[PDB]
Each structure stands twice: as structure tokens, then as C-alpha cells.
Amino acid sequence: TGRPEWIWLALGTALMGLGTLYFLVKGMGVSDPDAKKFYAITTLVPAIAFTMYLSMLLGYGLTMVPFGGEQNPIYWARYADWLFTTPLLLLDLALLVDADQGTILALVGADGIMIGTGLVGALTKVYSYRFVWWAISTAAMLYILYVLFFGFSMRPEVASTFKVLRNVTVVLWSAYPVVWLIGSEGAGIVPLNIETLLFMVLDVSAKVGFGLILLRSRAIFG
Amino acid sequence: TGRPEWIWLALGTALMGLGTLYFLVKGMGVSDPDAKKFYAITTLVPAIAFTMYLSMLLGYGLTMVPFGGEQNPIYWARYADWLFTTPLLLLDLALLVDADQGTILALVGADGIMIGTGLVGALTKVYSYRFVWWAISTAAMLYILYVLFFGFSMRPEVASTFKVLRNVTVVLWSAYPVVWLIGSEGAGIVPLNIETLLFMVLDVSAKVGFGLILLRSRAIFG
Amino acid sequence: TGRPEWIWLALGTALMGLGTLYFLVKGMGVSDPDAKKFYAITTLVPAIAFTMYLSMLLGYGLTMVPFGGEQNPIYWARYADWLFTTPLLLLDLALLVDADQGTILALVGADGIMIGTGLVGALTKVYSYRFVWWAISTAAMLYILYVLFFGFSMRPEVASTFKVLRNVTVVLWSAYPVVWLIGSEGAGIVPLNIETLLFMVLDVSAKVGFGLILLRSRAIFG
């Protein structure tokens, strides 16, 4: 359509759509309770991402925010996505290591603060304060990874699986704050169609790529 | 008042109001833990519905959406209702059969997608895409019922009670997509005051009627 | 800045900020699972309050609502705060007494109704109905305290700790409906900068003061 980034919003829609169906079909048969939990959490992520990617493609998940003497197109639907999918992804990691709820509660709530403050920053009409919310949001992210590393006798199937997904999680997640900072939301460096491509490549890897590495392992069974 | 559908918004308010009070009083005494769970979930549903029905009566839960060359009155407060009351209703059914959390997590999250995509459809300004969100929302509904039927050795008190409420649940819930499709939200076939009556009759049966059949049985005790 | 209440929004920001850091540092070391739960819930409260207090200071968590022939400044960010922090505070009390989930589910859901109806009232454009939502919201509050008192063999460390926090909870919480009624949201009696001071003093006591009395006791360990 009229927006150059349309193609990446369409490709993301498409890829999130087929990953859900792939994980749906694969969960066909599963009766192991715990396996039943990873399949639930992991199928719902691109399911949710699917709808939010489609709401961006179709124009609904977009809004104008004025600042720097311009009217900026901001896709708020990403934060409706992450708000639910990022604790679900952290949920996947925690269950995996059998995290006590005290740690789960800090992960989920720090996660909500990260996204919520991510969202406020995205919609704030005063240019410099946008970067204050980013920083707060980055401290929550930097908190989660900390617990991801020093916040946790596991079976060696869960460990390796865990180490794999923890590194894939730090590398992709830590790229989101960078992308936002240089993109349309912040400094206006990287064009909106390139950032939409970066977020698409990260989203698909963080959800479907993350999902294929997880459900492909016996780490999920009890 | 000025809106013809006012009378059904007032009758729903009223009926949701007295069902909460009826279930509140009835839970007076209950000390059985599990009974304590069905009473919690089941009292909260028309409690929440009460407030959302009243916000519609008083005008707050309503907004204009433009499309088809008209300004359409859309009651968004229904989705604030369902978003919380429909997982609670599915929660009632699951606990009842002692569903593993893997199934509960898929039910609740598929439910959120159904309502959330229901909501996006309701507020989308491009007429044909309204029907795309409906369809997605109907696939999630059709998913839940599937699990409602083929997604689950229970005591025979829970089974019969369960079968009763599962059929009452498929019959009423499956009517909501029909009503939306022919009503103000979609094709503009059935007038807004008639749809408001249909949703009122379904809501009251799905919550209070569903609640009286459930808490009236010993299926709820352990 | 230009708003006289700025100073109290800045002082609250500041105090919520240092209480989080204080509780964060203190949770450093903790490995007792249950202790890990009170520290999670209790650190997140002024953490969340911090962000919401800052969004009010910076102007984002504020909006104009017209009524009584005036344009009223309403800080909606308080309800984004409470919506998450008040069930967390009730969560702290319940875990403490080892509440069955039936009671927890009624507490959290009655709490959501209190805040949600608090919020609707705050944004309602018809002056008298504002007071209807308050009343409904006060019935939910009056419900929670009821369960706080007659809705529950505990260790005597939890009891005393519990009694302490239950009284501090009834006294501060019951003051919020009073403040709203006489402030900018309702009758327009107490000026906005004084109410912002009252809510600040209550918020800080209800969260950080409440937090220091709680985590300072061995009531939290198993």
C-alpha cells in the first residue's frame, strides 16, 4: 500500500501466521501435562503477534504523535503484543528451570514495567522525556537479564536448552532498545521502513525461531 | 432516555445487579475451599457485567465509529466485560473438570484473542476489514469449544454438571458471532435495539442462568 | 513548573524511587522462596508507583474532563497505578495469612472493580453519575475490608504482622474515597494541589511505609 513499510508488516503477518499453525499442529497429540504448558505458551505468542502484526498491516495499530516539529507514525500495537508475549516468553524460560514464583513474579512485573514504560515513551509528546522512559524501560530490561543470568541442579536437558534460549534471548531483546533509540520513536536516524524490518526479523526470531528451538527439544517433557 | 435500546440496558443492569447479590448472599457461610472458588468466579461475573451494563446505560461505555458513510454507535464496554468475564466463565468450566494449566492457559489466551480481536473489529474504520477480525475472532471461539469438547475419569457429579454447562456454553456463545455479524457492528441488518436485547438475553443466561445452574449443584464441592 | 501541585508529584516520584531501590537492595541475598515472594510483590509496588508518579510529574498521566461548566484536570495515571498495585498489596496480605485462592480471587476481582469503577467515575462527563461510580467503587472497597476482617490458626508472627498491616490498610485505604469525594474529581472542595498532597502522603505510607513494616519482620519467612 501507500506505506513503504507495508511489505514487512505483510511478511511478518504471514510468518507469524504460519508459525502458530505449525506449532498448533505439532501440539496435536501431546498429553504430557508440562509439554502441554510449553505448547500453550509458545503457540500463543505468534498467535498474538499474528493479530498484532495484522492490525499494523491493516492500519489499526498505528497512530500519529507530534514532536520535533513533525507528526510521527508510531505503531502502538507492538506494545499490546509484547505486554502479553514477553511475559509469556519469560514464562517459558522460568517454567523450564522451575523458577519459584517469587522470581516469576519479579520477571513478569519487571517485564510489564519495561513494556508499559516503553509504551509511555512511545506516546510522549515532549521529545526529551521520550528518552527518559526508554532509560527506565532499559533498566527493567537490564534487570530481567540479570535475573536471567544471576537470578536462578536442573536436568542437563533443561540447562543446555535453557542456555541456548537465554543467549538467544539476551541477544535479540537487547537489540530492541537500540532499534527504538535510532528509529522513528526516538532520534529519527533509521527510517521507519528499516526499523519495521529489524523489529520483524527480531520478532520472528524471538518468537518463532525461539519457539522452534524450544519445542524441538525434550527439555519440555517432565 | 433518548436511545431506544435504553430499556434493555436498564433491564440488564437490573438483572445483573440482583444476580450478583443473590450469589453473594448464597456464598454466605461457605467454607469449603473449592466451593469458595466457584462462588468467587461466579459472583464476579455479573458483578463485572453489572458495572459494564451500567456504564452502557449511563452512556459512558459507548462510542461513535464512522463507516459505510455513517456514524455507528458501538458499545465497547461489552469487550471490557467479556475480556474478564469470559475467561472467568471458562475458568469455571476448567476447574470443574480439573483441567491441567496447559489447557487453562490455552483457553484463557485463546479467549483473550477472541475478545481482543472482537474489539479491534468493533472499532475498525474500514468496513470490510471489520469482517476479517470477526473471522479471526470466530476461529478462536471455534478453538475454545473444540477444547471444550475434545480438549479434556471425572466424578459423575462434575460430568453431568459439566455436560450441562458445556452445551449451554456452546449454544449461547456461538450466538454472539451471529448477532454481531447482522447487527450494528457489521452488516447493519438487525437494529441496535434488537441486538442489545439479544446480547442482554444471552448475557443474562450465560452469566446468571449459567451461574444458577452451576452453584445449585454439589458439583462445586470437593 | 506551571502546575502548583508539581512539587508533590516530584516529591512522590522521589520517594517512590528510593523506596524501590531500598527494597531492591534489601532483597539482595534472599533465597527463602516465600521471602522471595513478599520481596517481589513489595518491591514492584513503588516501582510501579514510581513510574506512574513520574508520568504525572511529566504531564503524561493527566487529562482534561469537562463538567460543572469547567475543564477539570484529572490524573488518570493513579488508576493505572492502583489497578496493579492494590491487588499486589492485597496479595501481600493474603499470602501472609495463607489465604485460599477463593478468597484471593474475590479480593483481586473486587479490587479491580473498585479501581475500574473508580476510573470510570473519574472520566465521566455527567457530574452526578460521577458520584454513582464512587459509591459502587466504595461498596467494593467496603467489601474487601470486610473480607480483610471477617473473611479469613496462623503463626503468631503472621497474625501480629497481619493485624498491624490490616489496620494500616483500613485507615489509609478508607481515606482515598474521602479525598476523591471532596477533591477535583468530585465536589471541587479541596484544591487539586492539596489532594495531590494527601494522595502522595497516603500512597507513600500505603506502599513504602506499608513495605517497611512488612519486610522488616520475620513474618515473611517460612
Ligand SMILES: CC(C)CCCCCCCCCCCC[C@@H](C)CCCCCCCC(C)C
Ligand atoms: C521449522 C519450520 C517448519 C519453520 C517455518 C515456520 C514458519 C515461519 C518462519 C520460521 C523460520 C524462521 C527461523 C527463525 C529465526 C530467524 C533468524 C528468522 C528471521 C526471518 C527471516 C526470513 C527467512 C526464513 C524464513 C522465510 C523461514
Ligand SMILES: CC(C)CCCCCCCCCCCC[C@@H](C)CCCCCCCC(C)C
Ligand atoms: C434463582 C433466582 C433467585 C433467580 C433470580 C435472580 C435475578 C436475575 C434473573 C435470573 C433468572 C434468569 C434465568 C436465566 C436464563 C435466561 C434464559 C434468562 C433470560 C432473560 C429474560 C428475563 C426473564 C426472567 C427473569 C425476569 C428472572
Ligand SMILES: CC(C)CCCCCCCCCCCC[C@@H](C)CCCCCCCC(C)C
Ligand atoms: C526505612 C528507610 C530506609 C526509609 C526511607 C526510604 C525512602 C522513602 C521514604 C520512606 C519513609 C516513610 C515512612 C512511611 C510512612 C509515612 C507516614 C510517610 C509519609 C510521607 C511524608 C514524608 C516524611 C518522611 C520521609 C521524608 C522519609
Ligand SMILES: *C\C=C(C)/C=C/C=C(C)/C=C/C1=C(C)CCCC1(C)C
Ligand atoms: C516480541 C518479543 C520481544 C521478545 C520484544 C521484546 C522487546 C523489548 C525487550 C523491549 C525493550 C525496549 C526497551 C528496553 C527500551 C524502550 C523501548 C523498548 C520497549 C523497545
Ligand SMILES: *C\C=C(C)/C=C/C=C(C)/C=C/C1=C(C)CCCC1(C)C
Ligand atoms: C458475557 C459472556 C459471553 C459468555 C459473551 C461471549 C461472547 C462471545 C463468545 C464472542 C464472540 C464474538 C465472536 C466469535 C465474533 C466477533 C464478535 C464477538 C466478540 C461478539
Ligand SMILES: *C\C=C(C)/C=C/C=C(C)/C=C/C1=C(C)CCCC1(C)C
Ligand atoms: C496506592 C495504593 C492504595 C493502597 C490506593 C488505594 C486507593 C483506594 C483504595 C481507592 C478507593 C476509591 C474509592 C473507594 C472511591 C472512588 C475513588 C477511589 C478509586 C479513590
